[PDB]
A paper describes a structure:
14-3-3 proteins recognize protein partners phosphorylated at serine or threonine in certain sequence motifs in all eukaryotic organisms. 14-3-3 proteins have a highly conserved dimeric all-helical structure. Each monomer can bind one phosphopeptide via its amphipathic groove. Here we study the structural basis and druggability of 14-3-3 binding to E6 oncoproteins of four tumorigenic HPV types by a combination of crystallography, binding assays, and mutagenesis.
Here, we initially set out to analyze the mechanistic and structural basis for the 14-3-3ζ binding to the 18E6 oncoprotein. The phosphopeptide establishes multiple polar interactions with the basic pocket in the amphipathic groove of 14-3-3, largely reminiscent of previously solved structures of 14-3-3–phosphopeptide complexes. The conformation of 18E6 phosphopeptide bound to 14-3-3ζ within the chimera is practically identical (RMSD = 0.17 Å upon superimposition of Cα atoms of the peptides) to the 14-3-3σ-bound conformation of a synthetic 16E6 phosphopeptide reported very recently at a lower resolution. The observed conservation of most interface contacts within the two complexes suggests that these crystal structures can serve as templates to build accurate homology models of 14-3-3 complexes for other E6 phospho-PBMs or, more generally, other C-terminal motif III peptides phosphorylated on the antepenultimate position. Nonetheless, a few noteworthy differences appear in a subset of the crystallographic conformers of 14-3-3/16E6 and 14-3-3/18E6 complexes. On the one hand, in one of the four conformers observed in the asymmetric unit of the 14-3-3σ/16E6 crystal, the side chains of Arg –7 (Gln in 18E6) and Glu –3 form an additional in-cis salt bridge. On the other hand, Arg –6 of 18E6 (Thr in 16E6) mediates a bipartite interaction with 14-3-3 in most of the observed conformers. It simultaneously interacts with the carbonyl of Asp223 and participates in a water-mediated interaction with Asn224. As concerns contacts within the 14-3-3/E6 complexes, the crystal structures have shown that Arg –6 can mediate more interactions than Thr –6 with the generic 14-3-3 interface. Interestingly, position –6 is an Arg in the two strongest 14-3-3 binders (18E6 and 33E6) versus a Thr in the weakest ones (35E6 and 16E6).
Numbering used by the authors:
A (entry chain A): 0 to 240
B (entry chain B): 1 to 240
Amino acid sequence: HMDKNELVQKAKLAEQAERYDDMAACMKSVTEQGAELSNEERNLLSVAYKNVVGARRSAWRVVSSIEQKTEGAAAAQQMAREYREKIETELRDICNDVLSLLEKFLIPNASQAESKVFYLKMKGDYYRYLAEVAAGDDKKGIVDQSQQAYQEAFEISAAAMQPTHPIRLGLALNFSVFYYEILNSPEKACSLAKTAFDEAIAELDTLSEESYKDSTLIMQLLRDNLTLWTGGGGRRRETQV
Amino acid sequence: MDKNELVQKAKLAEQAERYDDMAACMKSVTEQGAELSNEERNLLSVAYKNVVGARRSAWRVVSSIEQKTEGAAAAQQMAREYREKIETELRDICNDVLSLLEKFLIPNASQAESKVFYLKMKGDYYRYLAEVAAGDDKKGIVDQSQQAYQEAFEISAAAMQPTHPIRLGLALNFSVFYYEILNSPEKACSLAKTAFDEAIAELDTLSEESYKDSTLIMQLLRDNLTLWTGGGGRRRETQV
């Protein structure tokens, strides 16, 4: 059995090799050893599972579009439907894997506000991924679970973290996307993103260069979504005194 | 199920970039024992190139990292063991493809261009084995790759046009084999240059579609030749 250092070293090797199943298995093993993850181990775990589920999400959108495009061909549409359902099962199993890890190991032992916000955001993300493909009688509960987790994360970070903190900015980005795509609520999605951006830009100048670089990267994403969602109108071009 | 349904599933898997599914569909088609159509042959080879390719790239990444870590030793052992795990997956993939080629693809090939395709594929997958083999094991593997390429080469020189994409692709890969596996760069260059030159003389007779098919591979030959003969005193190019 590998100790923690060997598992982290192997997860980094697997990352460079783009072997994300291996990477996630290593970081799940690290997690279940029961010690609080460091910032870099948190990033390795989250990057690994995002890529693992990300392959299915992309494949799911492709096959869904083919299923919609072949509506006049029974055999072709049925084959695409069955293949989408197969991908969905994989996707749900990955989400349930992550959600179980968050509930059983990560969230209960998060002793600092930063890490708890990170894991509650992650819980919001993976219920959101479930909500992207939920289409039966469980969608309503899943959508609510996502919003509850995001909101709990928002509550802790609003009180414990500066608005420039990358975790708080990343939470605002994804929670905004949840409102836009899952709830079909563009006005709330935009005001949430705009508020987090405005609150950060007021303090951005006070950061060290390295922290500034980190914050600005996420603030770029908030800006890009706002511009995408509001088009040429709404946003007024900027000039400088 | 039926051959046609499996082919449709393979094409769906291709669009979803799920190459394990794609490869599994086309393996089942091959195992039905009927000669593959050109479309089926390309789906099979595309699928397994992607499946094996993921390990080939991972193996090179891990090898490169392993060769650039000199401060530690237990980390060095962990990097080696991870490479050996990737190696085992790579060999199993190659052995899977080589078994299909021996049992179904090469025996059922009724036309010259098909036999050259599969003999080239056999050369390719022994070459992938040769990329990771060591010692006495490597010699036999390299010989297997060379013998397959050479038989494909002799058939294609006799029976296929020099512009045929399969003949040109054989020249390209056989040339890389000479350069990289046999450490014979001049012979690799002469093989690439001769195939390129032999195809030039008949490009004028081709349809637009065949002209593009042939020249796309001739550009890969030229790319390797430019890479292998270096810039030397070459001045960078600008276009009016």
